[PDB]
Amino acid sequence: GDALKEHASRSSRKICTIGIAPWGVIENRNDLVGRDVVAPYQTLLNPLSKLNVLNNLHSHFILVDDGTVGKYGAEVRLRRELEKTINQQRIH
Amino acid sequence: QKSWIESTLTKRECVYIIPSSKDPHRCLPGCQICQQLVRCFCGRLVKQHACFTASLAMKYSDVKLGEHFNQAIEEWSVEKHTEQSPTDAYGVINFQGGSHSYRAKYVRLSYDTKPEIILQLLLKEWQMELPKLVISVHGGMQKFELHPRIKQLLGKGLIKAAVTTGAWILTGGVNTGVAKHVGDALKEHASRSSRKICTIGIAPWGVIENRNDLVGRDVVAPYQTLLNPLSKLNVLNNLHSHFILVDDGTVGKYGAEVRLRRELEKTINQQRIHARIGQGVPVVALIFEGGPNVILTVLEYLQESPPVPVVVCEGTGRAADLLAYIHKQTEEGGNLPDAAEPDIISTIKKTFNFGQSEAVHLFQTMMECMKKKELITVFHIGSEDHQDIDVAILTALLKGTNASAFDQLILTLAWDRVDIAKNHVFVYGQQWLVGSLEQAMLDALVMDRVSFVKLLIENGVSMHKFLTIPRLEELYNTKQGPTNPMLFHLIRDVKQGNLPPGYKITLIDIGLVIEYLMGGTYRCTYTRKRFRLIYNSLETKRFPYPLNELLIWACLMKRQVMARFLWQHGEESMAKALVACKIYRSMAYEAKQSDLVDDTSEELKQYSNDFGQLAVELLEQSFRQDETMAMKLLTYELKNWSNSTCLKLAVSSRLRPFVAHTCTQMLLSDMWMGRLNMRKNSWYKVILSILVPPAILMLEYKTKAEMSHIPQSQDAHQMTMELPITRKFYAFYHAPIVKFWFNTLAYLGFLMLYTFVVLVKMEQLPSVQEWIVIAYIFTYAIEKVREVFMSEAGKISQKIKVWFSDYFNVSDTIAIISFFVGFGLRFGAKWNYINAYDNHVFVAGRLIYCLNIIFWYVRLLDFLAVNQQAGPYVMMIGKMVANMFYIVVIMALVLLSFGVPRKAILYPHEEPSWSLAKDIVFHPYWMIFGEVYAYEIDVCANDSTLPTICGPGTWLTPFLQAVYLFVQYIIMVNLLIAFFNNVYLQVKAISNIVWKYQRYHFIMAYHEKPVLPPPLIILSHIVSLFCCVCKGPKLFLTEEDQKKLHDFEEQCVEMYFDEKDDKFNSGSEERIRVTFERVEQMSIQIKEVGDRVNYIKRSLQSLDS
């Protein structure tokens, strides 16, 4: 993200950054809920928390869910899927 | 006394005289050389006192008969034995240097002065602003010269941390060592910080040269820079701007002001740095190349309420370098390794020979110091160690108080030092409280600190959660920053004139101002019902678009730099730029329409014309990207701006470069067409289809998808859902192009008839032509009445004043009023039946017709001004008539300078007659147009046609007329040619823009007009009154097209700011100047790597050993 911010506005609408995050370690988790919304979000890192906030410059998010907070190991397989399904498409 | 000083401050006079060592120097007679020598325990000899207790006492012996019992010799304490008396030295010294008469303010006070009194003198009398920092420099004296680089760095850094933090560099004053280096540092970086750094040297009245000269109550007292060839005494230094000349005794005794400096290092600490900030004014200590008693003074600081920290400058000298090494080689906060006393005390020994008796006594003054390392700072010169002392000094007061970062931040906010906040306060690991950055934001917005508002947003402050009602009320009700003093004159003019003394402004009162400055039908978010309820009751108190409420705030408070910040933030950029242009333009008009010392209108109109240009430059950016969506950007309803329109806001501010922009002119071209494609149709076929109705159904219309960027009427948009026959006629007759040509043919047919009625015999009753002609003008007038009612702002007087500002609409009222006078006299008149024109009511009626028709030919220039080529010539004619006025007044004077002598010389025998006002003006005017009256010149000639006018003096007139025409034709007509040639291009450029601008009001007037021209219009009028007692254009987007448009807006603002920097950065002026600055930095480094390698080649023969 910081790398994007240091070289943004020349590659802005050219680089698509998909973070595949779990629905576990995710802050303002209840806020992201809401079907088809312009849902809000913050950048004030929760003074006490071990939890993690989504990052500023990522343009897309795959918020996998199996359980709850913690359990930051259920999206690893899905990332692998998208690392495969793109491989089967012809580049041109 | 006419000086606050004299009533308040004093001096010290050693009233009481005491022996010296008691040895009369030599020379046997002792009684009188006792007078010659004996330095009082004061320190000045008996006769230097001149005191009144001691003036008429030397006659006997002096004070104190005889030996006075050795005990009582040890009793002179100035308190009992030295008197406080009115000042005698306060004024302005003057230094003799190159082009700088450097001034100061000496005071000469007693050391007993209350510390309150001092700060008062400094602030009110010397009119100094309370500092944001105090850099008290403590070092050693006569420290010859620092190394060249280390003088450069301590000379740039002290100046940079004092010019940016408005600081008071407290000094010693003596031109030796510290004050000597401070002063030279000032001189090497003066004239950028000249009237910003206030340097107060607190010097004693002891070691001071030309001491007797500084005496003199309220003087411009002189002073020198020629260092007394023999003297150990010290001279005040050139660049110190103020002086506190403490006095207790005499020369020597350079230790009685040390306590007073400490007072001023305290009294400033108890003042609040800013009206909004609770922190006290900081105080720092700067040690460079000190002394033996420095490390003592250092100790005192770090043991007080609160610990004044210390910034030491190693690499300069002895005490600093000593203090450098010792605290550097210290434990984390404590003792040392296996006893380091052997080297330390040896190190202390060489600077100062002490020798284990008190070289240990230093180790105690040298232990509690290094034990307080957290409060001590050191600038390691030559190691990029915080980038001259400006970082280090300012940093010293943030790291060394174990303070909250709230207070550490706010100090940077009062200092206006964003880099020190972003590099030392917003550093990783920092942990903030719930709403502490908010309180910093509120202070930054009020204090107009844009660069911290940027930072606090960039870190995490959301202006959605931040900005609330009771807060945004405060922001209007502040006096702690740059203010618009007219915002009260406006809030007065809307609230009936009554402002109580308190009157805390309300947002509802601001809404009333924004309605008044934006004019027309504007309804702000604050004046609505839904806000007047939530407001008086007091997420809901949080505004949905906060950066649109603050853009207005920054503008109403005349804060452009904050306005030009908050505008880039948020959405609806082009809209906000045209609002602001309108707010500043109305703020400017109400500033000129008012009485005030600072007009503040050339400031506001420039502010208006700055945002007006932002809108044009974003329109040109959107137009170069997509033309169809850019036209949609001109006509979408805004919904946060009173359902208004970016074009409507530009027309509201007469922002001609936006309406004359090719995008609007092309949308205007497409609204003129209507549903008709005039790219695959011709004007022949539009006229033909008006006269041949069924030819409407053989011409090319436009699809619904070629009409999406075009604002439409509802009924027009309801016939884009289906083209059938009756729909195809509704598309023709309601096009503004068709309403035009359908009115021109009626108007041209109207003049053809009214020309006929006026050239042909006019009988008793009006002919069928003249009835058709009256009907037109009658109904044409009903239309103009309807235009005025159905116009704009509901105030009847406003609609009036707008419509009577156009040239031809004034002509229309004279033309309509004059016609019905003439018809009243024509039709209302008793026909004579012998011969017409024996009735003068009838004649007067006709002659009004014959003159009224001139209005109606000239009105064809309004129809011809619809062409892109013709219309700018029509507007041009009038701009030139106004500009040629004064040339034509001179031509009218040369006329009368000739006609009056001529008529007088040629007609001497005339009684007073109105024919004398014609004959002085008639022939001389027709001469301007080539009629020479050849056979009336020289009336005594044989070919003369005025042979009876020959008489005395008439031979003068041909000479007079020769001069006359030379002036009029050879000078004045050709001066007027020359006028036009040299004003053509700029009136033609203005007239093209005024033409393009008025093409809005014209095209948009032909959407509202009925379909039928002014004879048959009455049907359309009646039908519109039927459906009034029985029952403009808008841009309709579906919700996905609004999405695609807000994207296009955002994407084009990004490309605008991106391409603005990419051009600035890619310019030779920018590439030469950054190249310039890099070659500087390199050259410095090349003569340092060049130095290191010179310290390597020495290490070829040393390693050889």
Ligand SMILES: CCCCCCCC/C=C/CCCCCCCC(=O)O[C@@H](COC(=O)CCCCCCCCCCCCCCC)COP(=O)([O-])OCC[N+](C)(C)C
């Ligand atoms: C943007 C839109 C703006 C609108 C602006 C509109 C402004 C309109 C402005 C209007 C101003 C009108 C001024 C008219 C002047 C009349 C004077 C006159 O002729 O007097 C003569 C006729 O006197 C009569 O009494 C005649 C009566 C029969 C004829 C009817 C008059 C029609 C008036 C027209 C109505 C116009 C309808 C207006 C419709 C709009 C008197 O002369 P006399 O008879 O020889 O001598 C009498 C003396 N004796 C008795 C001793 C013999």
Ligand SMILES: CCCCCCCC/C=C/CCCCCCCC(=O)O[C@@H](COC(=O)CCCCCCCCCCCCCCC)COP(=O)([O-])OCC[N+](C)(C)C
């Ligand atoms: C619709 C009817 C059109 C017919 C044309 C009528 C004239 C059209 C007029 C257009 C614009 C010019 C200014 C307005 C004129 C009015 C008086 C005036 O301003 O006086 C000026 C002083 O002038 C004098 O004191 C001398 C006037 C003597 C009058 C002699 C008339 C002789 C013939 C000549 C007439 C024959 C016609 C000449 C046409 C070329 C004061 O002006 P100002 O304070 O310096 O202000 C200038 C503008 N400013 C405010 C931006 C600075």
Ligand SMILES: CCCCCCCC/C=C/CCCCCCCC(=O)O[C@@H](COC(=O)CCCCCCCCCCCCCCC)COP(=O)([O-])OCC[N+](C)(C)C
């Ligand atoms: C923005 C523009 C505004 C205008 C500004 C300029 C002011 C214009 C004003 C000018 C002054 C005019 C004064 C007229 C005097 C009275 C005339 C009269 O009563 O009857 C005369 C009217 O009939 C005519 O034929 C003469 C009308 C004058 C025409 C003007 C032509 C010169 C242009 C002028 C322009 C240059 C001006 C230079 C500067 C001064 C007829 O003849 P008489 O003998 O007088 O009387 C009848 C007797 N008889 C039957 C025996 C014949």
Ligand SMILES: CCCCCCCC/C=C/CCCCCCCC(=O)O[C@@H](COC(=O)CCCCCCCCCCCCCCC)COP(=O)([O-])OCC[N+](C)(C)C
């Ligand atoms: C380039 C060519 C020129 C050569 C140079 C030499 C110059 C030659 C001049 C010579 C002067 C003599 C001429 C007049 C002859 C005698 C008297 C006479 O007949 O008078 C006549 C008029 O004329 C006068 O009454 C006087 C005219 C004087 C003006 C001459 C112009 C001065 C030079 C230039 C001035 C420019 C400015 C100067 C500054 C630069 C009488 O005739 P009338 O008028 O028909 O009236 C008679 C009928 N009545 C009795 C009913 C009235």
Ligand SMILES: CCCCCCCC/C=C\CCCCCCCC(=O)O[C@@H](COC(=O)CCCCCCCCCCCCCCC)COP(=O)([O-])OCC[N+](C)(C)C
């Ligand atoms: C308000 C909206 C108006 C719109 C128009 C609609 C209304 C127009 C419709 C009808 C109005 C006309 C009614 C005519 C009644 C008869 C008159 C009569 O007796 O004889 C006259 C006939 O008529 C003409 O010659 C026409 C007179 C007007 C001239 C202009 C016509 C064109 C303008 C309008 C149309 C063009 C469209 C313009 C578009 C480009 C003259 O007769 P004569 O033979 O010359 O006399 C012999 C002379 N002698 C005695 C010396 C021998």
Ligand SMILES: CCCCCCCC/C=C\CCCCCCCC(=O)O[C@@H](COC(=O)CCCCCCCCCCCCCCC)COP(=O)([O-])OCC[N+](C)(C)C
């Ligand atoms: C102070 C006077 C009254 C106030 C007038 C103020 C102006 C008001 C405005 C308009 C006036 C209304 C129209 C004309 C009226 C004609 C009257 C007339 O006498 O006509 C005569 C002929 O002439 C006509 O019939 C002319 C018909 C054409 C009129 C043009 C509009 C038609 C378009 C349609 C669209 C809408 C048109 C309407 C829009 C307003 C017939 O009358 P008569 O008696 O048989 O003969 C004459 C007299 N005589 C007997 C002595 C020989």
Ligand SMILES: CCCCCCCC/C=C\CCCCCCCC(=O)O[C@@H](COC(=O)CCCCCCCCCCCCCCC)COP(=O)([O-])OCC[N+](C)(C)C
């Ligand atoms: C709101 C706008 C302003 C309106 C102003 C008011 C307008 C109305 C004004 C006036 C009302 C009309 C007066 C009636 C006539 C009375 C005399 C009479 O009976 O007839 C006599 C008329 O003698 C004349 O001198 C007539 C002159 C009329 C023209 C003057 C008005 C010009 C208006 C300026 C233009 C303004 C245009 C609009 C500008 C925007 C003679 O005729 P007689 O009697 O049949 O017979 C002979 C008898 N006798 C020889 C013994 C005498």
Ligand SMILES: CCCCCCCC/C=C\CCCCCCCC(=O)O[C@@H](COC(=O)CCCCCCCCCCCCCCC)COP(=O)([O-])OCC[N+](C)(C)C
């Ligand atoms: C029954 C009746 C039968 C039919 C009647 C027929 C009647 C004929 C009627 C009119 C004649 C003109 C026809 C040409 C039109 C060309 C096209 C056009 O629109 O051009 C322009 C004219 O725009 C106007 O508004 C012109 C108005 C003309 C009226 C003034 C008359 C002058 C008289 C004074 C002279 C005195 C002498 C008068 C004689 C005594 C506008 O176009 P534009 O804005 O440039 O838009 C195109 C831009 N583009 C090129 C980029 C795409």
Ligand SMILES: CCCCCCCC/C=C\CCCCCCCC(=O)O[C@@H](COC(=O)CCCCCCCCCCCCCCC)COP(=O)([O-])OCC[N+](C)(C)C
């Ligand atoms: C009988 C029939 C004759 C022929 C009919 C001809 C019909 C007419 C033909 C063409 C008309 C031209 C169209 C005008 C276009 C709009 C201009 C406008 O609004 O105002 C313009 C000014 O004001 C004027 O220009 C006033 C109108 C000028 C007409 C000239 C009359 C001169 C005659 C009188 C002398 C006669 C001497 C003799 C006296 C007896 C705009 O000016 P500006 O610069 O934008 O702003 C002004 C402010 N400033 C001063 C600060 C700059």
Ligand SMILES: CCCCCCCC/C=C\CCCCCCCC(=O)O[C@@H](COC(=O)CCCCCCCCCCCCCCC)COP(=O)([O-])OCC[N+](C)(C)C
């Ligand atoms: C340009 C530089 C200077 C040079 C000027 C040269 C000077 C010129 C030379 C000489 C002076 C003019 C007189 C010479 C002609 C006399 C002949 C004569 O009788 O003429 C006439 C009278 O005329 C007079 O009586 C005119 C008297 C002097 C006029 C005022 C000076 C003019 C000079 C202005 C200078 C402007 C300077 C402006 C400065 C920039 C005709 O008289 P009459 O009809 O025969 O008499 C019988 C009549 N009765 C029958 C009714 C009884």
Ligand SMILES: C[C@@H]1CC[C@@]2(OC1)O[C@H]1C[C@H]3[C@@H]4CC=C5C[C@@H](OCCC(CO)CO)CC[C@]5(C)[C@H]4CC[C@]3(C)[C@H]1[C@@H]2C
């Ligand atoms: C600064 C400029 C200097 C030049 C000038 O403008 C101002 O000064 C003005 C003064 C005007 C005269 C004033 C008085 C009258 C009397 C009147 O007597 C009617 C008698 C009878 C009719 O037979 C009544 O029944 C006739 C007209 C006349 C001579 C004026 C003429 C024009 C003059 C000279 C004007 C000229 C243009």
Ligand SMILES: CC(C)CCC[C@@H](C)[C@H]1CC[C@H]2[C@@H]3CC=C4C[C@@H](O)CC[C@]4(C)[C@H]3CC[C@]12C
């Ligand atoms: C001194 C008076 C009584 C005699 C008549 C004056 C003359 C000069 C008047 C009579 C009617 C006048 C015209 C009437 C109508 C118009 C149309 C207008 O848009 C410009 C001025 C203009 C073109 C006028 C110019 C001056 C005019 C021609």
Ligand SMILES: [Ca+2]
């Ligand atoms: Ca000619």
